[PDB]
Amino acid sequence: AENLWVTVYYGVPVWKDAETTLFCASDARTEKHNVWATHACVPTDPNPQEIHLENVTEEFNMWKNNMVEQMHTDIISLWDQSLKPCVKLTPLCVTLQCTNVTNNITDDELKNCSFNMTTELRDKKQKVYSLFYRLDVVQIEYRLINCNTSAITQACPKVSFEPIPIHYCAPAGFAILKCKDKKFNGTGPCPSVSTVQCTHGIKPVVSTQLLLNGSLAEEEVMIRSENITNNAKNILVQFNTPVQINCTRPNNNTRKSIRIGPGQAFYATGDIIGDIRQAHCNVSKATWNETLGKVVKQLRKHFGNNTIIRFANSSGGDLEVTTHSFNCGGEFFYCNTSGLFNSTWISITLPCRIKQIINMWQRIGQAMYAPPIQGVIRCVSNITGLILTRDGGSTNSTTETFRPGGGDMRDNWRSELYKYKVVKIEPLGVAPTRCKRRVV
Amino acid sequence: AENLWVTVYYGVPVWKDAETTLFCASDARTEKHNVWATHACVPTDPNPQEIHLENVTEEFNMWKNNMVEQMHTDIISLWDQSLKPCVKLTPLCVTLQCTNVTNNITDDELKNCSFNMTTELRDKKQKVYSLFYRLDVVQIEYRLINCNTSAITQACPKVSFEPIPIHYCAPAGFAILKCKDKKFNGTGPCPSVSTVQCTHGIKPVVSTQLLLNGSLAEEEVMIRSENITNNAKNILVQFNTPVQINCTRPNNNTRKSIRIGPGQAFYATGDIIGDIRQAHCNVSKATWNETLGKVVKQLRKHFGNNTIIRFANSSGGDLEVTTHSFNCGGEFFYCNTSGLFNSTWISITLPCRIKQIINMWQRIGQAMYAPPIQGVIRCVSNITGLILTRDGGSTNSTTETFRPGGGDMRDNWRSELYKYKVVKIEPLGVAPTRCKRRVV
Amino acid sequence: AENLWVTVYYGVPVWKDAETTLFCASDARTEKHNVWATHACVPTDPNPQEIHLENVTEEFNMWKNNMVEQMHTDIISLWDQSLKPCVKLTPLCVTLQCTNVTNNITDDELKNCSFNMTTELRDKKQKVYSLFYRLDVVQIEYRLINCNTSAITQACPKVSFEPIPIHYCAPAGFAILKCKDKKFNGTGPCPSVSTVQCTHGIKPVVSTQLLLNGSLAEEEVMIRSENITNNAKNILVQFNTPVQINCTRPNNNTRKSIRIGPGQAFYATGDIIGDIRQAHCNVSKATWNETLGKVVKQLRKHFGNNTIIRFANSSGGDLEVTTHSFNCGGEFFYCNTSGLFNSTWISITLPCRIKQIINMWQRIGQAMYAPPIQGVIRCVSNITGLILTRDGGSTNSTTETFRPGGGDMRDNWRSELYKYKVVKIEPLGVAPTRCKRRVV
Amino acid sequence: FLGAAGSTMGAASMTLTVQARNLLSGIVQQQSNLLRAPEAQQHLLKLTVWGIKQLQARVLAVERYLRDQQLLGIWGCSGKLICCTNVPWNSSWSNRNLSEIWDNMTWLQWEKEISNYTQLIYGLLEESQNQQEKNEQDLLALDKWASLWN
Amino acid sequence: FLGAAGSTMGAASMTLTVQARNLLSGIVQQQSNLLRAPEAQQHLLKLTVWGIKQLQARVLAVERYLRDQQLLGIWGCSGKLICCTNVPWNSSWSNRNLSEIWDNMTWLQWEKEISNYTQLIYGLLEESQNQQEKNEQDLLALDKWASLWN
Amino acid sequence: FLGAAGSTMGAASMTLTVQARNLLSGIVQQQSNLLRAPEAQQHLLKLTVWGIKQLQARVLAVERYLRDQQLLGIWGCSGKLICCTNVPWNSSWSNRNLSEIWDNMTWLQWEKEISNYTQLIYGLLEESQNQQEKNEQDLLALDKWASLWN
Ligand SMILES: *[C@@H]1O[C@H](CO)[C@@H](O[C@@H]2O[C@H](CO)[C@@H](O[C@@H]3O[C@H](CO)[C@@H](O)[C@H](O)[C@@H]3O)[C@H](O)[C@H]2NC(C)=O)[C@H](O)[C@H]1NC(C)=O
Ligand SMILES: *[C@@H]1O[C@H](CO)[C@@H](O[C@@H]2O[C@H](CO)[C@@H](O[C@@H]3O[C@H](CO)[C@@H](O)[C@H](O)[C@@H]3O)[C@H](O)[C@H]2NC(C)=O)[C@H](O)[C@H]1NC(C)=O
Ligand SMILES: *[C@@H]1O[C@H](CO)[C@@H](O[C@@H]2O[C@H](CO)[C@@H](O[C@@H]3O[C@H](CO)[C@@H](O)[C@H](O)[C@@H]3O)[C@H](O)[C@H]2NC(C)=O)[C@H](O)[C@H]1NC(C)=O
Ligand SMILES: *[C@@H]1O[C@H](CO)[C@@H](O[C@@H]2O[C@H](CO)[C@@H](O)[C@H](O)[C@H]2NC(C)=O)[C@H](O)[C@H]1NC(C)=O
Ligand SMILES: *[C@@H]1O[C@H](CO)[C@@H](O[C@@H]2O[C@H](CO)[C@@H](O)[C@H](O)[C@H]2NC(C)=O)[C@H](O)[C@H]1NC(C)=O
Ligand SMILES: *[C@@H]1O[C@H](CO)[C@@H](O[C@@H]2O[C@H](CO)[C@@H](O)[C@H](O)[C@H]2NC(C)=O)[C@H](O)[C@H]1NC(C)=O
Ligand SMILES: *[C@@H]1O[C@H](CO)[C@@H](O)[C@H](O)[C@H]1NC(C)=O
Ligand SMILES: *[C@@H]1O[C@H](CO)[C@@H](O)[C@H](O)[C@H]1NC(C)=O
Ligand SMILES: *[C@@H]1O[C@H](CO)[C@@H](O)[C@H](O)[C@H]1NC(C)=O
Ligand SMILES: *[C@@H]1O[C@H](CO)[C@@H](O)[C@H](O)[C@H]1NC(C)=O
Ligand SMILES: *[C@@H]1O[C@H](CO)[C@@H](O)[C@H](O)[C@H]1NC(C)=O
C-alpha cells in the first residue's frame, strides 16, 4: 500500500485508571444541620443518567480502591468540623462522689454522682445532681475515664446523627465505571460494566461487626476477601435478605440542663421515671438460622464441605472489637452478640449496654460526650452482612472456626464501593489513514 | 424570499438577571485596621467609567434585590473576623459590689463597682476600681447583664469604627445597571438607565430609625415601600436636604488600664474629671419643621389629604426598636427621640443614653464590650431619611398615624442599592441572513 | 523600500521584572513533621534543568529583591502554623519558690524552683520539682520573665528544628534568572546569567552575627553592602573556606513529664546526672586568623590600606543583638563571642549560655517554650560569613573600627538570594516584514 | 461597552460593524481590576474572607468564558466572531420579514422571539458541521490523476 | 457519552462519525453540576471543607482541558476535531494491515499498540507543522508579476 | 527554553524557525510540576498555607495564558504562531533599515524601540481585521450567475 499519514482524533473514548478528588451530592428536605450533610454541600442531585457499554470487559479491584480512603478521610473531617463549635467540658473532669441507684431490677448499671459545679459567676459553685452509667467512671470517690487522656467537648444537641445517603459525583474529565455483573466477587475482569456520573445513595452508617442498611446483593450471598489463603484477612459477606433488628432502650431518660459559666448550657441525665430495664434487640431465630445456612453452603464453595463452627467475637480488646456497636437516634449501643454463633454444620434478645462518653470512634485522643435523649428510644432496620475472620492454626483438615471480627471502618465502605471505579479520560488519539494535507 | 441561513453572532449585547458574588473596592490613605476595610481588600478603585444606553427601559426592583443580602452577610462576617483575635472577658463575669456616684447633677446614671480581679500570676487577686453605667448591670450586689447569655470579648482599641465608603465592583461577565430616573420610586420600568463597573462610595453606617450620611435624593423627597396597602411593611423615606445633628457627649472620661493574667490588658473607665452632664444632640426646630412639611405633602399623594399625626414608638420592645441608636467615634448612643413627632396637619435637644456592653448588633448570643474613649466626644453629620410604619387599624378614613419603626438592618442598604441591578452577559446570539458557507 | 507590514510573533523571548508568589519544593525521606517542611509541600523536586544564555548582560539587585520578603513572611507563617496546635502554658505563670543548685563548679547558672501545680482533676494541686535556668526568671520568690507580656505556649516535642533545604520554584509564565559571574558583588549588570526553574537547596537556618552552612563563594571572599558610604548599613561578607565550630553542651539533662489538667503533658527538666559544666564551642585559632587576613586584604580594596581594628558589640542592649545566637538540635545557644575581635592590622573556646523560654524570634508578644533535650548535645558545621558594621564617626583617616552587628533576619536570606531574580514572560511581539495577507 | 444595547438590531448592525460593541474584550478586560491587586496587599491578617469569594468568582468567569470558545470550536466558528452555517433558516416557525428584523427589533426583543428552540438550533448546528461535513472532508482524500470528476 | 468505547475502531468509526461520541462536550458538560450550586448554598458555617477540594478539582479540569487545546493549536489543528498531517505514517515499526485496524481493534487496544513512541509521534508532528511549513509560508511573500514560477 | 533570548533577532530568526524557541509550550509545561503533586500529599494537617497561594498563582497563569489566545483570536491569528496583517508598517515613526532589524538587534532591544505605540499598534490591528474585513466577507454573499464581476 501507499505510505499512510497520521491523523489526530480529538475525543477518543479511551481511559486510564487515575486518582482524584470527588464531591458529595444530596437533596434538600430546613434542619440541614446534619453532621455529614455539611448544610447540603451539593444539594442538586439531578436525574441519574446511566449508560451501558456492553462490549468491554474492564478489570476492577476493591482492595486497591482509592475512593474508600477519600470516603474515610472525609467522614473524620466532617466529624471534627461538626464537633468544633460546640461546648468544651474541661471543667467537668473533677472528683465525683457517687452511689448506686435503687428502684428496679438488678443486672441493667447506673451511678448517682454529685460534684461541685455550675461555675456561673466565677465565684459560686453548687452541688449538682447527675446520673452516669458504668463503663465511663473509675475509682481513685470517682472520676471520668477520659481525664487521663484529653478533653471531653460535648455534642451540640441541635445536630442529628441519621446517616442520610450521599452521592459521589465525578469531576470533569473523569468517569465512574460500575460493574453490573451480579456474581463479581471482589477483584477481576467484570464483563458487564456501565458508566454513571454520580454514585447511588450511600448511607454513611458506622457499625462494627454487623453492617446495617447496606446494599443487598442477589440471592447468592457473596463472600469477599483479599485472599482466602491468609488467615489474617477480614472476610466480608453480603446478604440478599433484609433481616430485621428490633432494637430499643426501655427507659424514659429525663434531661437536666445545667448552666456552666457564661452562656454554655450542659445537659445531664435527670432522675428517670423509674422503670429501669435492660436495653435489648429482638432477632427472629428462624430467619437468622436460614441466613446462616445460605452462608455456610457458599462457604463450602471455597473449601471442603466439612465441620463449620462459629464462635463468640474474639475475647479481649475494647468493646469496639468485641460487641456489635452502633448508634440508634443519637444513642450509642453496645450489645454482647455472643448469642449468634454456635456450630452450624450437618425470637432472640441481645444484652445491649450503653456508653455515653465516647472515644473518637477510630482514634485515641479527643473524645466526645453524647447528650441524653428524652423519651423512649426504639429503632429498627435491616442488616446486609457481617465481617468474619478465619482462624486457621493447626486445623489442617477439619473443625473450621469463624469469629465475627472487624475493627476498621474502611471495610464498611469497601462493601459498597466495590462495584465502582474512577477513570480519567484521554481524548487525544492518533491513527494513520489515507488523507494528506493540501500544502499551499 | 430565498431560504435564509442562521448566522451566529458572538458578543451580542443582551443580558439576563442573575445572582453572583461581588467584591469590595476602596482607596488607600497606614492605619488600615478598619473593621470593614479588611486592610484594603481591593485598594485600587480606579476611574469610574460610566456608559449610558438611552434606548432601553429596563425594569428594576428593590424588594427582590440580591445585593442587599450580600451586603448584609459580608458586614457580619467582617464584624466577627475583626472581633476574633481580641481579648476575651470571660473572667469579668463576677459579683460586683457597687454604689452610686456623687459629684454633679442628677438625671444623667453611673455605678461605682469593685471586684476581685487582675488575676496576674494565677494566684494574686485585687480589689479593682471600676465605673460602669446603668443598663448593663443587674442586681441579685451586682453582675453584668450578659452573664446569663454568652461571652463578652472586648474590642481591640487600635481598630476604628468610621464607616469608610466602599465600592461593589462586578466580576467579569457581569454588569451593574443603574437607573438615572430621578423619580423612580421603588420598583418598575426605569426609562433612563446606565451601566457602571463599580458602585459609588457607600458608607456602611448602622443606625436604627434615622439613616445617616445617606445618598440624598432630589427635591421631591421620595416615599419607598413594598406596598402602601399592607400596614405591616416599613416605609422608607429619602431626603434632599442635609439636616444637621450636632451630637456630643459632655464628660472627659479617663481610661484605666488593667492587667489580666498574661499579656491581656483591659481598659476600664477611670474616675472622670468631674462634670457629669447629659449626652445630647441639638437639632434646629425650624429646619426640622420644614422637612416634615415636604414629607407630609408628598404623603398626601399616596392617599387622601387629611389628618396626619405622628407618634412616639409603641408596643415597647428593646432600646434598639425604640431609640435612635448609633455610634459616634466608637461610642454608642441611645437617644429618646420622642420629641420629634407631634401632629403636623393643616433648637431641640434630645436625651441620649449610653450603653457600653453591646449585644451582637443584630443577633442574640455573643456580645462585645466597647472600650472607653478618652476626652470629650462630639460629632455631627447629615440625616437622609427615616423608617416609618403605617398603623392602620380601624382608622377607615381619618387620623392617620405614623411612628418611626424599623429594626432590621437590611432596610438601610435597601435605601442605597435601590438604583442598582446586576445582570449576566450572554454574548452568544443567532440570526438568519443571506450568507451561506462555500462548501469545499 | 516598499511599505512593510506588521507581523505578530507569539512566544518572543523577552522579559520584564515582576513580582509574584513562589512555592517551596523538597524531597521525601516518615517523620515529615518538620516545621518548615509543612509535611512536604511540593515533595517532587525533579531534575534541575539549567539553561545558559551567554549573550545577555542582565542587571541584578539584592537590596531591592522581592524574594527575601516572600522568604521571610513564609518562615513566620510556617512558624506559627507549627506552633498553633501545641499546649498552652498559661497555668504556668505563677509564683516560684526557688533556690540554687549545689553539685559542681561555679560560673555555669540554674535555679531549683517549685510551685503549686499539676491541676489534674481541677481540684488537686501539687508541689512540683522543676529546674530552670537564669535569664528567664525574675524576683518580686520568683516568676517567669514573660508573664508581664503574653502567653507562653510550648513546642510540640515530636517536631524537629533541622533546617532541611528547600527550593523556590517559579510558577508558569515566570522564570528565575541566576547570575553566574563569580565576582558579582551586590548590584549591577551581570555578564553571565542563566535560567533555572527552581532554586538550589536553601537551608533556612536562623543565626545572628554569624551565618552558618551558607552558600560559600569563590576564593575572593566577597564584601556586600548597599553602599559603603553610609555607616548605618550592615555589611555582609561571604566565605570560601568551611571553618568549623565544634559546639556542645556538657550535661545529660533528664526530662520530667508533668500532667496538667486533661491530657496535656508538660516536660520540665529533671535533676541531671550531676556534672554541671559550661556550654562551649571550640574554634581553631589558626584558621580563624587566616580567614580574617583574607577579609581585611579585600577590605582594603574599598578604602585606604590602613589601621583596621575589630571590636566586641559595644556594651548593654539585649542578647540577640550582642551574642551569636542559634539553636543546636532544638537547644538554643547564646555565646559571648567577644573573643574573636582584636586589631588585625600590619583552639578558642567560647562561653555559651542557654535560654529555654524564647521570645518570638523576631517580634514582641507571643513567646514559645522549648522542651528540654535528653542526653548530651553536640553539633558542628561550617560558617560562611559575618554581618559587620562600619562605625565611622570622627575617624576621618585612620583607626577603622568594625563590630559584628546585625539583628534583622532578612539579611541571612539576602546572602543567598542575591544571585537570583524573577522575571515575567511576555510572549507577544510584533515586527514589520515583507509578508502581506492575501485578502479574499 | 454595551453602547448600543438599547438599539434595534438595525442600529445594532453597527455593533457588528464594530467589535460586537466591545463585548468580548469587555468580558475579559473586567478581569484586570482583580488582576491588578490580588497580591499587592501586604497584610498578614491570618485569615481571608475573599480568599474564596474572589476565587470562586474568578474561575466562574473562566468556565463561562470557555464554554463559548468550546461552542464556537464545535461549530467550526472558532476565531470568527461572525460566521454563517450550512444549516439554513430551517422550519423553525418564527419565520418572518427580514427588514422587520434587521431594521426595527432589539437584540433583547430578538431574544424574546427565539427564546424557544434555541437549544434546538444549537443541536442543529453541529449536525451539518460534523456529521456530514467532516466525513465529506474525508471523502476529499482521493487525489486521482485521470478520472477525478467522473 | 462513552457509548461505543467497548467497540472496535471500526465500530468506533461511527464515533468519529458523531461528535467523537460526545466526548469533548462531555469533558465540559460535567462541570455544569458544580456550575449550578457553588453559591446557591446560603449557609454561614464559618469554615469550608470543600472550599479547596472543589476548587482544586475545578481548576484541574481546566488545565487538563487546555493542554489539549494548546496541543491542537501547535499542530495547526485547533478547531478541527479530526485532521491529518504532513508527517506520514513514518518508520514507527508498528506497521500493519489497515483493515486489521479500522475493522477489528478497539481504541483501548489501539492505545496498547502505540503506547510506546507516542511522545515520539508528538514531537514528530510539530516538526513538519512549523519548522518547515511556517517558513514555507514565509516563502509565499513574493508576489511577482512576470517571473513567478521560474 | 529561552535558549537564544540573548541573541539578536537575526540570531533569533532561528527562534522563529523553531517553536518560538519552545516558549509557548514552556508557558504550559511549567504547570506540570504543580500538576504532578497537588493531591498526592496524604496529610490531614487541618489547615493549608498553600491552599490559596498555589491556587492564586495557578489561575494567574491561566488568565494570562488566555488573554493572548483571546488576542490572537481577535486578530484572526488564532492557531497561527506567526501571521502578517493587512495593516502595513504604518506611519509609526520608528521607521528604519530592515537589515538593521533582522540582522543586528535583540528582541529586548526591539522591545525598547517600540515600547511606545505598542497599544497604538494593538488597537490598529483589529480595525483592519474586523471593521473592514469581516463586512467585506459579508459582501461575498452574492453568488450571481451572469453579472458577477461587473
Ligand atoms: C434503620 O432504618 C431506619 C429506616 O428509616 C433508619 O431511620 C430510622 O427510622 C425510624 C422509623 O422506624 C425513626 O424512628 C422515628 O421516626 C419518626 C418519624 O415520624 C420520628 O418522629 C421519631 O422521633 C423517631 O425518630 C428513626 O428516627 C430513624 N433514624 C434512626 C437514627 O433510627 C435508621 O437510621 C436505621 N438504623 C441504622 C442503625 O442504620
Ligand atoms: C457624620 O459625618 C462626619 C463627616 O466626616 C463623619 O466623620 C466624622 O467627622 C468628624 C469631624 O466633624 C470627626 O471628628 C474629629 O475629626 C478630627 C479630624 O481632625 C479628629 O482629629 C478628631 O479626633 C475627631 O475624630 C470624626 O472623627 C468623624 N468620625 C466619626 C465616627 O464621627 C461621621 O462619621 C458621621 N457620623 C455618622 C454617625 O455617620
Ligand atoms: C551543621 O551541619 C550539620 C550537618 O548535617 C547539621 O546537621 C547536624 O548534623 C549532626 C551530625 O554531626 C547531627 O548530630 C547527630 O546526628 C545523628 C545521625 O546519626 C543522630 O542520630 C544524633 O541524634 C545527632 O542528632 C545533628 O542532628 C544535625 N542537626 C542539628 C540541628 O545539629 C547541623 O544542623 C548544622 N548546624 C547548624 C547550626 O546549622
Ligand atoms: C473471583 O473472581 C475472580 C475473577 O477473575 C477470580 O480471580 C482470579 O481467577 C483466576 C482463575 O480462577 C485465578 O487464577 C486467579 O488467582 C484469581 N485471582 C484472584 C485475585 O482471586 C477468583 O478466582 C474468584 N474467586 C475468589 C475467591 O476471589
Ligand atoms: C411607582 O412607580 C411604579 C412604576 O411602574 C408604579 O408601579 C406600577 O404602576 C402601575 C400603574 O400605575 C400599577 O398598575 C401597578 O400596580 C404598579 N406596581 C407597583 C408594584 O406599584 C407605581 O404605581 C408607583 N407608585 C408606588 C407607590 O409604587
Ligand atoms: C560592584 O559592582 C558594580 C557593578 O556595576 C559596581 O556598581 C557601579 O559601578 C560604577 C562604576 O564603577 C559606579 O559608577 C556606580 O556608582 C556603581 N554602583 C553601585 C550601586 O555600586 C560597583 O562599583 C561595585 N562595587 C561596589 C562596592 O558596589
Ligand atoms: C429494609 O428492607 C425492606 C424490604 O425490602 C425495604 O423496603 C426497606 O427500605 C429496607 N430499609 C430500611 C427499613 O431502612
Ligand atoms: C452633609 O451635607 C453637606 C452639604 O451638601 C455636604 O457638603 C457634606 O459632605 C455632607 N456630609 C457630611 C458632613 O458627612
Ligand atoms: C562543610 O564543608 C565541608 C567541606 O567542603 C562539606 O563537605 C560539608 O558538606 C559542609 N557542610 C556541613 C558539614 O554541614
Ligand atoms: C435610539 O433610537 C433613536 C431612534 O429614535 C436613534 O436616533 C438613536 O441613535 C438611538 N440611540 C442608541 C444609543 O441606540
Ligand atoms: C458490540 O459488538 C457487536 C459485534 O459482535 C456489535 O453487534 C455491537 O453493536 C457492539 N456494541 C457496541 C455497544 O459497540
Residue numbers in the entry:
A (entry chain C), B (entry chain E), C (entry chain A): 31 to 59, 63 to 141, 145 to 176, 190 to 395, 411 to 504
D (entry chain F), E (entry chain D), F (entry chain B): 522 to 671
Article excerpt on this structure:
Hence, it is the sole target of protective antibodies arising naturally in patients or elicitable in uninfected individuals through vaccination. Here, nanodisc-embedded spike protein was investigated by cryo-electron microscopy and molecular-dynamics simulations, revealing spontaneous ectodomain tilting that creates vulnerability for HIV-1.
This map allowed us to build an atomic model for ectodomain residues 31–662 and a backbone model for residues 663–671 (see “Methods” for more detail). For gp145 by itself, the distance between Glu662 (the end of the C-terminal heptad repeat; CHR) and Trp666 (the beginning of the membrane-immersed MPER) is ~10 Å. Our structure indicates that the MPER-N segment is partially buried in the lipid bilayer, consistent with a previous NMR structure that showed the MPER to form membrane-immersed helical segments. To compare the conformation of the MPER in the context of the full Env trimer, we measured the distance between the N-terminal end of the MPER segments, i.e., the Cα atom of residue Lys665, between adjacent protomers.
